[PDB]
Amino acid sequence: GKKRKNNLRNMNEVGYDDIGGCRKQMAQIREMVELPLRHPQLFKAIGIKPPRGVLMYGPPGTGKTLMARAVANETGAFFFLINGPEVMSKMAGESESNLRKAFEEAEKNAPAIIFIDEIDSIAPKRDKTNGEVERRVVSQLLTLMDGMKARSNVVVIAATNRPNSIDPALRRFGRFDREVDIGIPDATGRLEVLRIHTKNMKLADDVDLEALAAETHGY
Amino acid sequence: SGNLEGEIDISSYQVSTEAEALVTADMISGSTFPSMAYINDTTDERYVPEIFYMKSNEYGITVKENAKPAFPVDYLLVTLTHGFPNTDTETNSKFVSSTGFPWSNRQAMGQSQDYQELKKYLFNVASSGDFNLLHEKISNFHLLLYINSLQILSPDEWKLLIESAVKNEWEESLLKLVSSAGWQTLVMILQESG
Numbered sequence: 001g002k003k004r005k006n007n008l009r010n011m012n013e014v015g016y017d018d019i020g021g022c023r024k025q026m027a028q029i030r031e032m033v034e035l036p037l038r039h040p041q042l043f044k045a046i047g048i049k050p051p052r053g054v055l056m057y058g059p060p061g062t063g064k065t066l067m068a069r070a071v072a073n074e075t076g077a078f079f080f081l082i083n084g085p086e087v088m089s090k091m092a093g094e095s096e097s098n099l100r101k102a103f104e105e106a107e108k109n110a111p112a113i114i115f116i117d118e119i120d121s122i123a124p125k126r127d128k129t130n131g132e133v134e135r136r137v138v139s140q141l142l143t144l145m146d147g148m149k150a151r152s153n154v155v156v157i158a159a160t161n162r163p164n165s166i167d168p169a170l171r172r173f174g175r176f177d178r179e180v181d182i183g184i185p186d187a188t189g190r191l192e193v194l195r196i197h198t199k200n201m202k203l204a205d206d207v208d209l210e211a212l213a214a215e216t217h218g219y
Numbered sequence: 220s221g222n223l224e225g226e227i228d229i230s231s232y233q234v235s236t237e238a239e240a241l242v243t244a245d246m247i248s249g250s251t252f253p254s255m256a257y258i259n260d261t262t263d264e265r266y267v268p269e270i271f272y273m274k275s276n277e278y279g280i281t282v283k284e285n286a287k288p289a290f291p292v293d294y295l296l297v298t299l300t301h302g303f304p305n306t307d308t309e310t311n312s313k314f315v316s317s318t319g320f321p322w323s324n325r326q327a328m329g330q331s332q333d334y335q336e337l338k339k340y341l342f343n344v345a346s347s348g349d350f351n352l353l354h355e356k357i358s359n360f361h362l363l364l365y366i367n368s369l370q371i372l373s374p375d376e377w378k379l380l381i382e383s384a385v386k387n388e389w390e391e392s393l394l395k396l397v398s399s400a401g402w403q404t405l406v407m408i409l410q411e412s413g
């Protein structure tokens with residue numbers, strides 16, 4: 001069926017059918033995440049080291065988390081989620097422990113995917129990292145990512161609002177080197193989104209979703 | 220109480236200087252939980268402020284937690300270490316005793332100090348001599364207290380008795396005591412008593 005599959009076919013029930021209007025970026029993230037994990041033999045045969053980090057960004061509400069969760073569920077790999085706020089709400093000295101745990105658990109269950117949602121809230125711009133705790137957490141994250149090179153079949157995905165909001169040290173070789181940009185959709189994309197969302201509403205007979213898609217620009 | 224292996228080990232403790240200053244103003248009471256001590260209220264005589272007990276967490280950070288209902292008493296203790304003198308015979312003890320004449324008010328058991336026990340314990344040595352034997356029978360803390368309570372010997376006689384029983388130089392004092400009139404009356408009545 002679908003997703004390793006009424007039996008064969010609430011954030012673990014999202015697939016590629018719940019996303020519309022982002023074919024290009026979806027293809028990029030898929031070819032960057034699935035192939036290293038689903039088919040690691042290609043890279044062994046061709047003798048290359050696939051990049052690990054992936055950094056998505058775009059305006060809020062563009063479905064970054066939706067895409068990450070959909071890719072994780074479709075790949076069928078051990079998925080570990082890290083939220084910037086909830087990591088940064090822990091008592092002093094516990095955020096680093098949470099990061100170390102997350103990464104150790106991900107490593108021990110390879111293949112795995114680590115999704116750091118809203119990474120700009122735990123590794124913000126170096127100017128905004130005013131405080132001992134901010135520096136300690138940023139350093140812990142950098143150490144964990146640097147020490148992951150030995151780890152294999154583990155991919156880290158980070159989502160941020162803008163490229164200039166995270167610490168510049170996270171955008172180097174051996175770190176979030178690949179980048180993806182999500183933009184507002186076009187008329188076809190908006191029509192697809194409308195069809196996705198209004199697939200359960202009791203729409204009246206006189207609905208012109210095409211007209212709505214035409215009228216709704218910048219949404 | 221007994222150690223982890225099932226023995227009769229002994230432990231020594233001492234309460235801190237703030238627990239000592241906390242109980243004086245009441246402010247503490249025992250709780251149904253053995254390890255935790257309760258806290259009293261702000262009555263019209265005793266005024267109890269908010270009590271915080273400070274602890275350090277596993278991350279090396281001190282954390283203050285309000286404990287009005289009850290707090291552990293481990294913050295009100297300091298632990299000492301006990302021991303016994305090395306087997307090397309230093310003999311700095313004040314008494315070669317603690318095995319003999321019955322102790323203090325143990326009337327519940329058969330240990331009842333009385334003239335018969337003296338007649339059976341401290342009379343054969345006083346009827347023979349062997350001043351060393353008499354000295355090692357006379358150096359019992361509880362025996363000294365008992366004979367003092369008997370009040371047969373006058374204060375000076377008892378002072379020379381204690382200094383004969385506790386001082387490393389006792390020959391002359393022991394001879395003076397055994398020759399003293401008070402001791403002679405004591406031993407005579409003890410012999411006559413049955």
Ligand SMILES: Nc1ncnc2c1ncn2[C@@H]1O[C@H](COP(=O)(O)OP(=O)(O)OP(=O)(O)O)[C@@H](O)[C@H]1O
Nearest residue numbers: 018019020021060061062063064065066117159193
């Ligand atoms: N194609 C689509 N693109 C974007 N959002 C979509 C799409 N289809 C449905 N949605 C809905 O739009 C909302 C997107 O919210 P989402 O949390 O994914 O965005 P985000 O701001 O990028 O995420 P986050 O703050 O968690 O990183 C969700 O309701 C999702 O169900």
